[PDB]
């Protein structure tokens, strides 16, 4: 009853710090059956282990980088900066998104597909190379559409966030994309994105 | 909270128990074990010594005493309490031999010792008497008109005729062993052998001359304690 007790005190130190938020350049896709996500220009598949399809079906979807243009040809890719350019890629369709999720600057290259043939050449993982392909870039309805023939149709649409940059004339840019270095399991990949414009 | 009732002999538990007398009962187990066996040819008492020093004179430790030539006693509990009880027993026997010039039944001996007991909560203690329960368990043996008779007396004043009873420190185990050992056709010699065996398997130390006191009562002779040579004789066979 006659307790009347004193009291001690044990403090707990507390502190933390938000680091420099790290940009993860990750692409996601569910083209045929697998929710594959890859980090990356060295390529490494995060989830969606050894792909049921070949890598090439998705190698064409890979801001911050743009093709090399001469001084004669207006470089819509370049002057669209600092914001960059958002494109719609039709193969299966591909779109690039910039989001702020969590503490990672997400440069999504979100992939999606359908109409996978039961014996199509894209899933047996056979692959020789991608021969140099010329994209004819021209303006249809205020959107920079690039028509390219796939050799191993592409209906690329490029829109700048700065909707004031003048549209370049219809030219023919030669892309040469090939899977430089990889592994058999295709989990440690190095990609090539060389491409130069030609009038 | 039991504690409010163990203070005083005149208190009733919620279960109506006598905690003070139960503690007196437990006080027996502090004493040494005493075994009495009853058979047709007589009654025999075996008691340990629980000697503390070899210098202790054996006669001074009195774990068996004779109330009368025909009746023998064993006690387990407070030695002064036991001596008062035993002196009262001898006085009451002499009283009966004065009034009736006859030797009483051992049942009457336990009756009168019981009236000396269970007087703790009696108003007759005005001149001076026990204000607490007696602290010794008793074992009466003898031979009367009913042949051999053995009784066990509880400090609360309870008395029971027994064919064989073990009290004291090792009461429970010794009683359990005798329960299987005992046969109603026990002879005196085999009874004493069984008692010494029970002591051997119950005693803390080896059975020698100076650890066991032994007494016998038969209809023919009187109370007889085994002398040094006699106890040596009864111990050489075992």
């Amino acid at each position: 009853g006659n307790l009347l007790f004193l009291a001690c005190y044990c403090i707990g130190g507390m502190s933390a710090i938000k680091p420099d938020m790290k940009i993860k350049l990750r692409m996601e896709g569910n083209v045929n059956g697998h929710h594959f996500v890859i980090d990356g220009m060295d390529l490494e598949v995060k989830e969606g282990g050894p792909l049921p399809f070949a890598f090439d079906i998705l190698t064409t979807a890979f801001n911050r980088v743009f093709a090399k243009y001469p001084d004669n040809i207006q470089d819509y890719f370049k002057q669209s900066f600092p914001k960059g350019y958002s494109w719609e890629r039709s193969l299966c369709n591909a779109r690039n998104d910039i989001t702020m999720e969590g503490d990672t600057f997400y440069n999504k290259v979100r992939f999606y597909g359908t109409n996978f043939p039961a014996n199509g050449p894209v899933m047996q993982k056979k692959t020789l190379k991608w021969e140099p392909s010329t994209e004819k870039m021209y303006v249809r309805d205020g959107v920079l559409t690039g028509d390219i023939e796939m050799a191993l149709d592409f209906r690329t649409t490029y829109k700048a966030k700065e909707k004031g940059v003048k549209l370049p004339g219809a030219h023919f840019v030669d892309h040469c994309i090939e899977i430089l270095s990889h592994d058999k399991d295709y989990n440690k990949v190095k990609l090539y994105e060389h491409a130069v414009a030609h009038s | 909270t039991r504690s409010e009732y163990d203070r005083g002999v005149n208190t009733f538990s919620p279960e109506g128990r006598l905690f003070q007398v139960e503690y007196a009962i437990e006080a027996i187990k502090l004493g040494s074990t005493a075994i009495g066996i009853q058979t047709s040819e007589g009654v025999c008492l075996a008691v340990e010594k629980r000697i503390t020093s070899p210098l202790m004179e054996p006669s001074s430790i009195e774990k068996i005493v004779e109330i009368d030539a025909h009746i023998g006693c064993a006690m387990s509990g407070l030695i002064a309490d036991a001596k008062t009880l035993i002196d009262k027993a001898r006085v009451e026997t002499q009283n009966h031999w004065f009034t009736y010039n006859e030797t009483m039944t051992v049942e009457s001996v336990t009756q009168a010792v019981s009236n000396l007991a269970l007087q703790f909560g009696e108003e007759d203690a005005d001149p001076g008497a026990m204000s607490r329960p007696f602290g010794v368990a008793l074992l009466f043996g003898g031979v009367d008109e009913k042949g051999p008779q053995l009784f066990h007396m509880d400090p609360s004043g309870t008395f029971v005729q027994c064919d064989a009873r073990a009290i004291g420190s090792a009461s429970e185990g010794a009683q359990s062993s005798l329960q299987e050992v005992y046969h109603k056709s026990m002879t005196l010699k085999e009874a004493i052998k069984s008692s010494l065996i029970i002591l051997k398997q119950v005693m803390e130390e080896k059975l020698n001359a100076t650890n066991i006191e032994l007494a016998t009562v038969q209809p023919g002779q009187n109370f007889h304690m085994f002398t040094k040579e006699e106890l040596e004789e009864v111990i050489k066979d075992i």
């Binding site: 009853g1 006659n2 307790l3 | 279960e15 128990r17 006598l18 007398v21 139960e22 009962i25 509880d154 609360s156 004043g157 309870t158």
Partner: protein, 253 residues
């Protein structure tokens, strides 16, 4: 803070007048607060109810809570005598507030409790001051079950504080009969049993004494060798009950 005490009034028995009084003390004013405001009077905030410890003062409280389907608080008197200061300094206040936000609620304080010696003073003072310190409309009611009516603080038993009064008498033979037949409703008991004989053989056996006798008849039918729940285990139960332990003490004649 249980919300469903799971009673239909079909579980408790022998308190017909008690349940009627309790209903008209709590739920009838709660249901008919309009009729009370018509009377130009304040409905009772406090219902003090008392009885022995074996008369199930909580099973009726749970029955009331289930009937009124409201939130059910529960506080214990012997819980409060220890834990020194804080008995109502941060407990009764918080409990009453918990009732307030989680409406409708039926606060419960069980057991008598004494109603050095200075902490219980603040306990009852906070009890009274915050039972008064609340909304007059009285959306939430309080049931106070005590084991005796010997200690009575006039401020607490006064009007407004604890107006209604409920008494729990000695349960009778019919109360027993109904209570073991209710407790054995989940039993595959043959009708050969004489619940009336058991009830008349359950003298002094109030309430909680069933729990003992009825469920121990159950586990004795288990102990009987999986025998059907006939009298053959039930009379053994009534003989065992709280006296099942045999002291087996000597020095008794």
């Amino acid at each position: 803070v249980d919300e469903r005490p799971t009673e239909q009034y079909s579980d408790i028995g022998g308190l017909d007048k008690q349940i009627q009084e309790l209903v008209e003390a709590i739920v009838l004013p709660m249901n008919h607060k309009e009729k009370f405001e018509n009377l130009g009077i304040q409905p009772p905030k406090g219902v003090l109810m008392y009885g022995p410890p074996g008369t199930g003062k909580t099973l009726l409280a749970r029955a009331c809570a289930a009937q009124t389907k409201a939130t059910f608080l529960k506080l214990a008197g012997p819980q409060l005598v220890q834990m020194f200061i804080g008995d109502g300094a941060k407990l009764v206040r918080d409990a009453f507030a918990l009732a307030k936000e989680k409406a409708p609620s039926i606060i419960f304080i069980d057991e008598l409790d004494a109603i050095g010696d200075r902490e219980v003073q603040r306990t009852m003072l906070e009890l009274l001051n915050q039972l008064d310190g609340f909304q007059p409309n009285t959306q939430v009611k309080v049931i106070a079950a005590t084991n005796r009516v010997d200690i009575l603080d006039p401020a607490l038993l006064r009007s407004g504080r604890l107006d209604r009064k409920i008494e729990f008498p000695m349960p009778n033979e019919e109360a027993r009969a109904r209570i073991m037949q209710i407790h054995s409703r989940k039993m595959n008991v043959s009708p050969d049993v004489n619940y009336e004989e058991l009830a008349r053989c359950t003298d002094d056996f109030n309430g909680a004494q069933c729990k003992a006798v009825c469920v121990e008849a159950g586990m004795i039918a288990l102990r009987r060798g999986a025998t059907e729940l006939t009298h053959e285990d039930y009379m053994e139960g009534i003989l065992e009950v709280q006296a099942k332990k045999k002291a087996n003490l000597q020095y008794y004649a």
